[PDB]
Design a protein around this motif. Sequence first.
Motif, PDB file in Angstrom:
ATOM      1  N   UNK B  61      15.865   5.454 -12.163  1.00 28.17           N
ATOM      2  CA  UNK B  61      16.515   5.306 -10.860  1.00 28.17           C
ATOM      3  C   UNK B  61      15.515   4.873  -9.783  1.00 28.17           C
ATOM      4  N   UNK B  62      14.302   4.539 -10.212  1.00 26.32           N
ATOM      5  CA  UNK B  62      13.188   4.258  -9.318  1.00 26.32           C
ATOM      6  C   UNK B  62      13.284   3.140  -8.287  1.00 26.32           C
ATOM      7  N   UNK B  63      13.378   1.889  -8.734  1.00 25.24           N
ATOM      8  CA  UNK B  63      13.494   1.554 -10.146  1.00 25.24           C
ATOM      9  C   UNK B  63      12.574   0.408 -10.535  1.00 25.24           C
ATOM     10  N   UNK B  64      13.134  -0.801 -10.540  1.00 28.30           N
ATOM     11  CA  UNK B  64      12.417  -2.012 -10.925  1.00 28.30           C
ATOM     12  C   UNK B  64      11.870  -1.885 -12.348  1.00 28.30           C
TER      13      UNK B  64
ATOM     14  N   UNK C  58      12.867   0.656  -1.285  1.00 29.81           N
ATOM     15  CA  UNK C  58      11.666   1.370  -0.902  1.00 29.81           C
ATOM     16  C   UNK C  58      11.530   2.460  -1.955  1.00 29.81           C
ATOM     17  N   UNK C  59      10.722   3.481  -1.711  1.00 29.47           N
ATOM     18  CA  UNK C  59      10.587   4.530  -2.705  1.00 29.47           C
ATOM     19  C   UNK C  59      11.396   5.766  -2.381  1.00 29.47           C
ATOM     20  N   UNK C  60      12.253   5.652  -1.373  1.00 26.72           N
ATOM     21  CA  UNK C  60      12.818   6.819  -0.712  1.00 26.72           C
ATOM     22  C   UNK C  60      14.249   7.155  -1.133  1.00 26.72           C
ATOM     23  N   UNK C  61      14.494   7.214  -2.438  1.00 29.88           N
ATOM     24  CA  UNK C  61      15.817   7.575  -2.950  1.00 29.88           C
ATOM     25  C   UNK C  61      16.031   9.091  -2.924  1.00 29.88           C
ATOM     26  N   UNK C  62      15.097   9.803  -2.303  1.00 32.71           N
ATOM     27  CA  UNK C  62      15.059  11.258  -2.319  1.00 32.71           C
ATOM     28  C   UNK C  62      16.232  12.071  -1.785  1.00 32.71           C
ATOM     29  N   UNK C  63      16.504  11.988  -0.484  1.00 27.40           N
ATOM     30  CA  UNK C  63      15.803  11.088   0.420  1.00 27.40           C
ATOM     31  C   UNK C  63      15.410  11.780   1.716  1.00 27.40           C
ATOM     32  N   UNK C  64      16.253  11.615   2.734  1.00 28.84           N
ATOM     33  CA  UNK C  64      16.021  12.171   4.063  1.00 28.84           C
ATOM     34  C   UNK C  64      14.696  11.662   4.635  1.00 28.84           C
ATOM     35  N   UNK C  65      13.697  12.537   4.697  1.00 31.88           N
ATOM     36  CA  UNK C  65      12.362  12.122   5.111  1.00 31.88           C
ATOM     37  C   UNK C  65      11.587  11.579   3.911  1.00 31.88           C
ATOM     38  N   UNK C  66      10.951  10.428   4.092  1.00 29.29           N
ATOM     39  CA  UNK C  66      10.137   9.823   3.046  1.00 29.29           C
ATOM     40  C   UNK C  66       8.945   9.107   3.648  1.00 29.29           C
ATOM     41  N   UNK C 107       7.835  -5.018   5.281  1.00 29.10           N
ATOM     42  CA  UNK C 107       6.562  -4.411   4.904  1.00 29.10           C
ATOM     43  C   UNK C 107       6.778  -3.369   3.818  1.00 29.10           C
ATOM     44  N   UNK C 108       7.912  -2.683   3.902  1.00 32.62           N
ATOM     45  CA  UNK C 108       8.272  -1.646   2.947  1.00 32.62           C
ATOM     46  C   UNK C 108       8.642  -2.229   1.593  1.00 32.62           C
ATOM     47  N   UNK C 109       9.421  -3.310   1.617  1.00 33.30           N
ATOM     48  CA  UNK C 109       9.907  -3.960   0.399  1.00 33.30           C
ATOM     49  C   UNK C 109       8.774  -4.369  -0.542  1.00 33.30           C
ATOM     50  N   UNK C 110       7.788  -5.090  -0.014  1.00 32.45           N
ATOM     51  CA  UNK C 110       6.652  -5.521  -0.825  1.00 32.45           C
ATOM     52  C   UNK C 110       5.815  -4.355  -1.314  1.00 32.45           C
ATOM     53  N   UNK C 111       5.722  -3.315  -0.489  1.00 31.76           N
ATOM     54  CA  UNK C 111       4.857  -2.176  -0.773  1.00 31.76           C
ATOM     55  C   UNK C 111       5.346  -1.350  -1.964  1.00 31.76           C
ATOM     56  N   UNK C 112       6.660  -1.272  -2.142  1.00 35.39           N
ATOM     57  CA  UNK C 112       7.230  -0.491  -3.237  1.00 35.39           C
ATOM     58  C   UNK C 112       7.022  -1.169  -4.588  1.00 35.39           C
ATOM     59  N   UNK C 113       7.382  -2.446  -4.682  1.00 33.28           N
ATOM     60  CA  UNK C 113       7.204  -3.184  -5.925  1.00 33.28           C
ATOM     61  C   UNK C 113       5.725  -3.247  -6.289  1.00 33.28           C
TER      62      UNK C 113
END
Lengths: 126, 126, 126, 453, 48, 48
Positions: B61-64, C58-66, C107-113
């Motif tokens: 579910x991360x994912x990628x 992003x990496x924030x599927x947690x979520x709330x605060x990330x 900025x977030x999009x590139x940072x996660x991958x």
Amino acid sequence: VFLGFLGAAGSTMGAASMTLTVQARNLLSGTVWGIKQLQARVLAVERYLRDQQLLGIWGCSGKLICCTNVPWNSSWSNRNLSEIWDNMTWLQWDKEISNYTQIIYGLLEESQNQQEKNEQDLLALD
Amino acid sequence: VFLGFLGAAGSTMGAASMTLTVQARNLLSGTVWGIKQLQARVLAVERYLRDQQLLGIWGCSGKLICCTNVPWNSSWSNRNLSEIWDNMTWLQWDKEISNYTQIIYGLLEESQNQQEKNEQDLLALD
Amino acid sequence: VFLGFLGAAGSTMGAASMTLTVQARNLLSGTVWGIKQLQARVLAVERYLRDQQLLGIWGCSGKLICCTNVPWNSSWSNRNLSEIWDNMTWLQWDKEISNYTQIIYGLLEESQNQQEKNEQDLLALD
Amino acid sequence: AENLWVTVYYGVPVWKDAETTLFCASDAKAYETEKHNVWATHACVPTDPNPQEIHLENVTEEFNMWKNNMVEQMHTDIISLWDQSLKPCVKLTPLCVTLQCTNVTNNITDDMRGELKNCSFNMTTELRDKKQKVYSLFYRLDVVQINSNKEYRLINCNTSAITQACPKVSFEPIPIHYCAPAGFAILKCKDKKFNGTGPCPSVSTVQCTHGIKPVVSTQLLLNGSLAEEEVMIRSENITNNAKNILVQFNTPVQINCTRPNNNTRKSIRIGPGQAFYATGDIIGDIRQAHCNVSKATWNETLGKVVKQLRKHFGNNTIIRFANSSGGDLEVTTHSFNCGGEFFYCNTSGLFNSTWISNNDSITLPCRIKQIINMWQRIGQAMYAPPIQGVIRCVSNITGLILTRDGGSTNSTTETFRPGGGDMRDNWRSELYKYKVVKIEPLGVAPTRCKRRV
Amino acid sequence: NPQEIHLENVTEEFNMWKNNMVEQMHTDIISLWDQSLKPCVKLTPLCV
Amino acid sequence: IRSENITNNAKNILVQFNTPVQINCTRPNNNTRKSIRIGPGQAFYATG
Ligand SMILES: *[C@@H]1O[C@H](CO)[C@@H](O[C@@H]2O[C@H](CO)[C@@H](O[C@@H]3O[C@H](CO[C@H]4O[C@H](CO)[C@@H](O)[C@H](O[C@H]5O[C@H](CO)[C@@H](O)[C@H](O)[C@@H]5O)[C@@H]4O)[C@@H](O)[C@H](O[C@H]4O[C@H](CO)[C@@H](O)[C@H](O)[C@@H]4O[C@H]4O[C@H](CO)[C@@H](O)[C@H](O)[C@@H]4O[C@H]4O[C@H](CO)[C@@H](O)[C@H](O)[C@@H]4O)[C@@H]3O)[C@H](O)[C@H]2NC(C)=O)[C@H](O)[C@H]1NC(C)=O
Ligand SMILES: *[C@@H]1O[C@H](CO)[C@@H](O[C@@H]2O[C@H](CO)[C@@H](O[C@@H]3O[C@H](CO[C@H]4O[C@H](CO)[C@@H](O)[C@H](O[C@H]5O[C@H](CO)[C@@H](O)[C@H](O)[C@@H]5O[C@H]5O[C@H](CO)[C@@H](O)[C@H](O)[C@@H]5O)[C@@H]4O)[C@@H](O)[C@H](O[C@H]4O[C@H](CO)[C@@H](O)[C@H](O)[C@@H]4O[C@H]4O[C@H](CO)[C@@H](O)[C@H](O)[C@@H]4O)[C@@H]3O)[C@H](O)[C@H]2NC(C)=O)[C@H](O)[C@H]1NC(C)=O
Ligand SMILES: *[C@@H]1O[C@H](CO)[C@@H](O[C@@H]2O[C@H](CO)[C@@H](O[C@@H]3O[C@H](CO[C@H]4O[C@H](CO)[C@@H](O)[C@H](O[C@H]5O[C@H](CO)[C@@H](O)[C@H](O)[C@@H]5O)[C@@H]4O)[C@@H](O)[C@H](O[C@H]4O[C@H](CO)[C@@H](O)[C@H](O)[C@@H]4O[C@H]4O[C@H](CO)[C@@H](O)[C@H](O)[C@@H]4O)[C@@H]3O)[C@H](O)[C@H]2NC(C)=O)[C@H](O)[C@H]1NC(C)=O
Ligand SMILES: *[C@@H]1O[C@H](CO)[C@@H](O[C@@H]2O[C@H](CO)[C@@H](O[C@@H]3O[C@H](CO[C@H]4O[C@H](CO)[C@@H](O)[C@H](O)[C@@H]4O)[C@@H](O)[C@H](O[C@H]4O[C@H](CO)[C@@H](O)[C@H](O)[C@@H]4O[C@H]4O[C@H](CO)[C@@H](O)[C@H](O)[C@@H]4O)[C@@H]3O)[C@H](O)[C@H]2NC(C)=O)[C@H](O)[C@H]1NC(C)=O
Ligand SMILES: *[C@@H]1O[C@H](CO)[C@@H](O[C@@H]2O[C@H](CO)[C@@H](O[C@@H]3O[C@H](CO[C@H]4O[C@H](CO)[C@@H](O)[C@H](O)[C@@H]4O)[C@@H](O)[C@H](O[C@H]4O[C@H](CO)[C@@H](O)[C@H](O)[C@@H]4O[C@H]4O[C@H](CO)[C@@H](O)[C@H](O)[C@@H]4O)[C@@H]3O)[C@H](O)[C@H]2NC(C)=O)[C@H](O)[C@H]1NC(C)=O
Ligand SMILES: *[C@@H]1O[C@H](CO)[C@@H](O[C@@H]2O[C@H](CO)[C@@H](O[C@@H]3O[C@H](CO[C@H]4O[C@H](CO)[C@@H](O)[C@H](O)[C@@H]4O)[C@@H](O)[C@H](O[C@H]4O[C@H](CO)[C@@H](O)[C@H](O)[C@@H]4O)[C@@H]3O)[C@H](O)[C@H]2NC(C)=O)[C@H](O)[C@H]1NC(C)=O
Ligand SMILES: *[C@@H]1O[C@H](CO)[C@@H](O[C@@H]2O[C@H](CO)[C@@H](O[C@@H]3O[C@H](CO[C@H]4O[C@H](CO)[C@@H](O)[C@H](O)[C@@H]4O)[C@@H](O)[C@H](O[C@H]4O[C@H](CO)[C@@H](O)[C@H](O)[C@@H]4O)[C@@H]3O)[C@H](O)[C@H]2NC(C)=O)[C@H](O)[C@H]1NC(C)=O
Ligand SMILES: *[C@@H]1O[C@H](CO)[C@@H](O[C@@H]2O[C@H](CO)[C@@H](O)[C@H](O)[C@H]2NC(C)=O)[C@H](O)[C@H]1NC(C)=O
Ligand SMILES: *[C@@H]1O[C@H](CO)[C@@H](O)[C@H](O)[C@H]1NC(C)=O
Ligand SMILES: *[C@@H]1O[C@H](CO)[C@@H](O)[C@H](O)[C@H]1NC(C)=O
Ligand SMILES: *[C@@H]1O[C@H](CO)[C@@H](O)[C@H](O)[C@H]1NC(C)=O
Ligand SMILES: *[C@@H]1O[C@H](CO)[C@@H](O)[C@H](O)[C@H]1NC(C)=O
Ligand SMILES: *[C@@H]1O[C@H](CO)[C@@H](O)[C@H](O)[C@H]1NC(C)=O
């Protein structure tokens, strides 16, 4: 072994807690008639998302089995481990805990945000 | 560099595995005509959720990119690393593994629930 | 204490960052009229998924605060911590950072991958 | 520590102003009404048994009721809803025919004109082969002299077609709630002195509006919710005479209305399936439709509006009330439904005053129509069937739609007149408390925090 | 290839006289039929 | 010049030009229209 969707209906909550990925599987993909199709197609994603909604406002987006930090109020059931996991079925078990499921959910809701508000403080200092 | 949605079509599976967040991006947001709009609007979330459905019934579910515990049956491809990541394209690669993708998915389904049923036992003893 | 959905409107961004699970909660579940209902029912899941879409890319599927790895460009706000968390409200705060929210998202999009492409290399060597 | 990092927030309390399709809510008693009568109560979702409106402390919101959508949306919903109802209802295509009409059996003074024309006409039969001369009764307003016979026609015959409302339907205004979708809020100005435009200190979010029943009426608006303290007089641009004034009362002024004649209905077989509801014999006396209000309370409440008006036009000013200047019957008179028939009540008696700086009732006559052309109709009209028996309704007056005279000359004698025309004003009158916003929960802000490696 | 998974060890309280999908069906049949007749020609003048 | 099966005469040929060839067209008569009341609401537009 592979029983089928809902196959572990009359199986013990332990054995039924094996085949979780099968019930979770057959749950999405599968002008008179045309309208029927449409308000059934949305109903299925609405009903599905409402569960992911809960798992997500808890910490259990994993998901399937997910442990938590709210302790079991004995008032809810009070039965021993063996006699629910190696005895009772979920059809049966559901009707006992049914009286407080939404109250239980509320305990979960506060507990998750409490985790997040805390974990930020850890990564903050470290 | 930024190519565009699907820009790495004829790029190597290594270079195409860079721009994943771009194809994943343009995938949701973007009375005769009125009905067309509606059964296209649901089709897009149905089709989208069916992928999240899979990533979720796996652990991804991360994912990628997400690694797993099912080992690669050589019968599926048997090609070397270099000649698929630094050589072949996903359009091409898809047609080879196409014969067993749903069989491969099944290996994934059991493996995830197997992880969960196990990890509960760890947090149980500890 | 429990204020209600949107209750912390005129509350400080610190106090409003407590009640996040309440705004996140009342956000899904809750022939003339019949059509109104349908294009409102889809609108709500479309609008909802578009946020999960972002949290997920992003990496924030947690979520709330990330938390993340993109550092705060002072040009965006430049205000001190106290005067936004123990002072300003989110209604107010939103209009300041509004000029660059989509640039910030990029900025977030590139940072996660970038994280994923890296973490595979760790599990690869180990 | 000096280095800050953005951390994203989900569930942040913030909204952007919006427009969107809302949906209706009504209560169980509306479905208990049965009789296949109420419009769209069935497709309409239910209300809440325990409704909650969360007050939002410490926040202000810039309302504007003259640039709202959910009144334009509502106005539209009402026109559509109504027009979908008439599809099954029978077409009075062949009723457009050369009538041969006289006056109704009566001994009235010459001055009093005949308003009930007894009309005989060749009507169609269940069989294409034949015809039938049959008679019905029509109001003078529902017919026109066509041209030593005295022959007439239904007035719609040159403007539009005609479709008879099903008697198995009802015109009663039942309370509607406008509920928002998910991730959409409605914000409610709880300030008890708000003129409808500007920052509101007391505000609350809420899913659905209150029970807004669709009373479609000119001049005075009725049965609406009333103000909590003062008689509030609201307008878009008060200084400009071209814009109307929406008066919202503080106290209800009860106005009783009636059609005294015990009218009778016969049914005429157009055939097959088609059946025209003619107006039969009048049982008893031939009297005049009218409405009564207390002269005492009208005095009292017209005094309240003046006390408020002088806050806008000066303390040393004359504010008198005059009747309509001239126009369509739709606007020159207090129009409403009462028991299932449509009224047209002369308001000259109410707006006939004068106000300086410092025990019976008001009988006001009415007219009645059956072929109606509401909402500025052009190609379609509707025949409202005769409602058998005697009719009377009792209602409160909740407001007014007044209009000032632009002649001016800086005179401290600017008078007012009742208006109407655009029906959005009525929903504007009830929806002033509400505003629709788009919820955006994804907050991003810096806190001293980096995510792990 | 239709499949109906048997559920072992479970009992279920049926009632066919308080079912919906027959009321739903009955309705579907009446509607379906009535929508078919809209294009079909009207015998208005045959009443003679 | 595009076609499904060029060899087969039964299939048409779609010619797509390279240059536009401007073609001017007209009805020279200053025709007039009168409106006839079928009534009510119905109204036929005759050629005057
Ligand atoms: C529903 O439908 C009903 C059926 O369609 C309809 O009822 C019909 O209504 C019309 C009009 O009101 C009636 O026509 C009139 O009938 C009068 C009665 O006469 C009848 O009986 C006589 C015996 O008593 C017969 O002699 C007579 O027929 C004879 O006369 C004919 C004359 O041409 C001749 O051709 C025949 O062969 C035959 O010999 C008939 O059967 C009749 O008297 C009347 O004529 C004049 O008198 C009327 C008053 O009684 C006047 O109202 C009328 O206007 C006529 O005057 C004419 O002549 C004057 C002198 O020249 C002119 O100045 C006038 O302008 C007028 O001229 C007009 O009328 C001429 C007709 O003759 C016409 O030719 C001219 O071109 C000009 O247009 C007239 O014929 C009919 O009888 C009714 N039928 C039935 C079955 O009841 C009813 O109205 C519809 N509506 C409703 C609500 O029910
Ligand atoms: C501003 O608001 C005011 C306040 O609401 C509006 O006033 C309304 O005006 C309406 C007319 O425009 C009016 O509706 C008509 O009322 C007629 C009078 O009879 C009703 O009311 C009395 C009390 O006044 C009541 O006693 C009657 O019946 C009661 O008892 C029976 C059982 O015996 C119940 O079935 C019924 O629901 C009602 O129950 C009441 O009593 C019990 C206790 O016994 C309580 O527990 C309940 O809670 C409840 O209080 C009548 O209900 C009435 O004759 C009219 O009926 C016609 O229209 C309705 C439309 O729904 C239809 O169902 C009827 O069958 C009938 O139409 C058909 O039949 C005719 C012949 O029978 C035929 O000629 C027609 O063509 C049709 O085929 C109608 O109901 C309404 O009552 C009042 N409001 C109030 C509170 O009284 C005012 O109009 C508003 N202003 C504006 C501008 O709109
Ligand atoms: C728009 O319409 C509304 C209504 O649709 C109008 O409002 C109405 O206005 C009338 C008056 O104009 C109000 O009636 C009043 O009722 C009072 C209470 O009466 C009840 O209680 C007494 C006990 O105190 C009972 O005895 C009564 O029952 C008896 O009477 C009825 C008939 O009325 C019979 O059917 C019964 O069998 C009983 O016999 C009632 O239950 C009443 O006090 C009041 O005046 C009475 O008293 C004065 C003296 O003070 C008398 O001069 C007068 O004649 C009345 O006498 C009646 O009552 C006595 C007992 O008090 C009896 O002994 C008599 O025989 C006689 O019946 C008056 O009658 C009504 O309540 C009110 N309704 C509403 C909803 O507001 C609006 O005005 C109108 N507006 C416009 C602008 O048009
Ligand atoms: C909405 O409502 C308004 C107000 O009600 C209404 O305006 C009025 O319209 C009517 C016409 O429909 C106007 O006509 C009046 O009708 C009465 C009734 O006539 C009877 O009485 C006369 C004799 O008085 C008889 O001949 C007749 O046959 C009837 O029996 C008339 O009485 C009125 O006439 C008065 O003015 C005449 C001219 O001045 C006098 O000659 C006559 O005697 C009447 O007395 C007036 O003048 C006297 C001095 O000469 C004076 O002492 C009296 O006090 C009185 O002032 C008149 O013809 C009526 O005037 C309108 N009302 C007003 C205030 O203008 C609207 O028409 C209605 N809306 C619509 C769309 O219709
Ligand atoms: C809106 O509501 C109003 C009420 O608020 C209602 O007004 C009523 O109008 C009628 C007229 O249609 C009033 O009836 C009479 O009106 C005359 C008008 O006289 C004027 O015009 C003549 C020329 O025609 C002039 O010569 C005269 O000077 C006036 O300018 C009044 O004169 C009548 O009142 C006289 O008698 C009263 C009782 O004795 C005296 O107290 C009063 O002072 C008047 O006497 C004066 O005139 C005499 C000559 O006529 C003279 O000799 C005296 O010395 C003195 O100067 C009378 O009022 C009726 O009264 C009005 N209602 C009320 C309550 O006053 C409207 O009809 C209504 N409109 C609608 C549409 O509903
Ligand atoms: C409620 O409504 C009233 C009016 O009913 C408003 O009051 C007016 O407010 C305006 C300013 O907001 C005052 O100013 C006037 O503006 C006119 C503009 O018209 C010109 O421009 C348009 C642009 O399309 C042209 O189409 C048009 O032909 C005009 O050229 C001016 O014309 C007025 O006169 C000035 O210009 C002429 C030359 O054109 C000079 O000769 C004059 O001396 C003068 O310099 C003027 O400037 C206007 O006076 C106000 N009128 C009244 C009656 O008060 C309120 O603003 C409104 N309330 C709200 C809240 O909006
Ligand atoms: C563009 O269109 C042209 C035709 O307009 C195509 O050209 C033809 O191509 C075919 C092969 O693709 C050539 O071959 C001929 O095929 C016939 C098939 O018909 C038989 O089978 C069907 C099956 O349903 C029967 O219904 C039917 O009755 C026939 O039995 C043969 O009949 C031809 O003759 C052969 O068989 C007979 C016996 O039946 C012998 O007597 C003959 O000697 C011979 O052996 C033949 O085999 C055909 O000739 C081509 N025709 C032309 C005019 O060129 C193109 O292919 C097409 N382009 C594209 C890209 O598809
Ligand atoms: C029937 O009613 C008509 C009116 O619709 C009467 O005729 C008119 O009566 C009024 C009365 O004031 C006059 O002003 C009109 O001038 C009359 N009309 C004409 C053309 O003169 C008629 O008298 C009534 N009775 C009958 C038998 O028709
Ligand atoms: C939960 O358990 C505690 C004791 O463990 C008991 O006092 C309490 O009543 C229980 N909760 C409810 C709702 O009964
Ligand atoms: C997978 O690989 C094993 C040996 O590694 C082989 O025996 C087996 O046949 C392969 N699977 C398939 C489906 O061929
Ligand atoms: C971000 O900050 C740097 C210095 O910290 C500055 O040079 C740059 O201009 C800022 N970004 C923008 C868009 O202004
Ligand atoms: C209001 O009521 C008083 C009561 O006597 C009456 O005299 C007065 O004329 C009324 N107001 C007006 C403007 O007529
Ligand atoms: C008008 O005068 C009264 C006198 O009591 C005063 O209370 C009020 O505020 C004044 N209003 C205006 C607009 O001047």
